[PDB]
């Protein structure tokens, strides 16, 4: 269906066989319904101890990316991409990754995701060859390569073959029916289609109004979605 | 120093060698500062297919964790760390983590973290087996194996010996002064520690009001701060 390819760059190109060769992400790329090509920095080096790393203007305790290795690695990305590829950097001062943030860089059929070490790259790299900054999450971590494979995890389940909403997830039950005193919802036992689908919803609304009420405030819940939020509300306050 | 010990469970142990094998949490573990031991619920399985999904009552057309070996697996794991293990659960249900939650997070010495395939794990799996719910993002992924990944080398970062603020990071620039026209900041070349330190808190204290306004407004900025970002402001507005 939907190809995608997907270029990285990354000091550690072996971290992404995490998702090339597992599960459903290990599939899709077996099955060229996704590509993950990586461009090593280290490979760029001409420095007889292959330095990737560089002292930062100012002084400051950590280090950053050299950026000959670097600048030369995304270059090789963009030419083997062609044009319509996306370059982007994974970093906390990036905009933050939801759902409807997925979907859109999901719109790509090419995407370079540049994978920072140290304390970050250049910002005048940035701003010449990065076009989009992202962010999975307000925290910090040891290098880009975390958030560039979730960013493709997220991705690749947009992609048609890969597999086969704004609230919360329903509770799930499965067998057995009575798990430690604790028994399933006879309602799932029914077989009544419609009040199943009614349930997961309600519980749907339930979970998210109790534990993130703040992503109801931005949603316009259709009618049959206010009424099984006002149920769920009537019913929680006994 | 504080050695910090995760127990895993997973259908898929081999991602994990992401971090227990490169970069700093590699390092981590191969001094011995941080443990990762990961539990297949594969292994837990008794027919002849090694069968580790079932479906969902209720009908639905996606999957759950067999109760079974999953249940088998988490209760291996709680015997091997003794007492004091926080077993956490990643889903998008979960708790938000920001860098706030990681700090909570890297308090425990014992952890073991759930990683969920499929459409989740049962209700009352985590009712009876799981502490905390937490979430890396609003986004989902095809397995809790990445998140699990993104919150061990979030706290393996405040592990004493592993390495060497509220606001979003300053600019930093390296080798070489100039950059396809783009110049380093003088004040940078200066020398002046003090205008040095004063810059980089002044164009965090922007570059946090330009891209994540909110972050702001849970801040209460010491007077150099409330300072460096008046002039910011002023500077920006010409
Ligand atoms: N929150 C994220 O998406 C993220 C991205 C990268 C990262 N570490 C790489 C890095 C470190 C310092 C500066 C720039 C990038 N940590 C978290
Ligand atoms: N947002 C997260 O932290 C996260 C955690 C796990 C995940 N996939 C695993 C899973 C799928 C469905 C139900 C429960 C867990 N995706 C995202």
Same mark, same amino acid.
């Given at each position: 269906? *939907?190809?995608?390819?997907?270029?990285?760059? *990354?000091?550690?190109?072996? $971290?992404?066989? /995490?998702?090339?060769? @597992?599960?459903?992400?290990?599939? /899709? #790329?077996?099955?060229? +319904? =996704?590509?993950?090509?990586?461009?090593? &920095?280290?490979? @760029?080096?001409?420095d007889k101890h292959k330095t990737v790393d560089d002292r930062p203007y100012g002084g400051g305790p950590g280090m950053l990316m050299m950026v000959q290795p670097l600048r030369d690695a995304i270059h090789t990305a963009k030419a083997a991409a062609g044009e319509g590829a996306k370059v982007i950097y994974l970093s906390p001062q990036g905009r933050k990754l939801d759902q409807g943030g997925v979907t859109? +860089? /999901?719109?790509?059929?090419?995407?370079? +995701? #540049?994978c920072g070490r140290y304390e970050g790259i250049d910002e005048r790299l940035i701003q010449t060859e990065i076009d989009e900054e992202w962010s999975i999450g307000d925290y910090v971590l040891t290098g880009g390569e975390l958030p560039a $494979?979730?960013?493709?995890? /997220? #991705?690749? !389940? @947009?992609?048609?073959?890969? =597999?086969?909403?704004?609230?919360?997830?329903?509770?799930?039950?499965? !067998?057995?029916? #009575?798990?430690?005193?604790?028994?399933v919802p006879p309602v =799932?036992? *029914?077989?009544?289609? %419609? %009040?199943? !689908?009614?349930?997961?919803?309600?519980? *749907?609304?339930?979970?998210?109004?109790? !534990?993130? &009420?703040?992503? =109801?405030?931005?949603?316009?819940?259709?009618?049959?979605?206010?009424?099984?939020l006002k149920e769920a509300q009537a019913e929680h306050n006994s």
């Amino acid at each position: 269906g *939907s190809h995608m390819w997907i270029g990285v760059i *990354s000091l550690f190109p072996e $971290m992404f066989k /995490a998702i090339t060769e @597992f599960g459903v992400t290990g599939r /899709a #790329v077996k099955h060229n +319904l =996704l590509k993950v090509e990586c461009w090593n &920095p280290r490979d @760029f080096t001409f420095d007889k101890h292959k330095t990737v790393d560089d002292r930062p203007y100012g002084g400051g305790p950590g280090m950053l990316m050299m950026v000959q290795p670097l600048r030369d690695a995304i270059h090789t990305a963009k030419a083997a991409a062609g044009e319509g590829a996306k370059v982007i950097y994974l970093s906390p001062q990036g905009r933050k990754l939801d759902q409807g943030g997925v979907t859109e +860089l /999901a719109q790509n059929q090419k995407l370079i +995701l #540049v994978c920072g070490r140290y304390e970050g790259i250049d910002e005048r790299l940035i701003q010449t060859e990065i076009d989009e900054e992202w962010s999975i999450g307000d925290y910090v971590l040891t290098g880009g390569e975390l958030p560039a $494979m979730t960013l493709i995890d /997220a #991705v690749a !389940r @947009f992609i048609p073959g890969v =597999l086969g909403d704004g609230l919360l997830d329903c509770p799930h039950y499965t !067998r057995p029916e #009575v798990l430690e005193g604790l028994t399933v919802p006879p309602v =799932l036992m *029914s077989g009544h289609h %419609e %009040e199943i !689908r009614k349930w997961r919803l309600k519980q *749907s609304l339930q979970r998210t109004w109790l !534990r993130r &009420p703040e992503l =109801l405030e931005g949603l316009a819940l259709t009618d049959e979605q206010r009424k099984l939020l006002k149920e769920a509300q009537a019913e929680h306050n006994s």
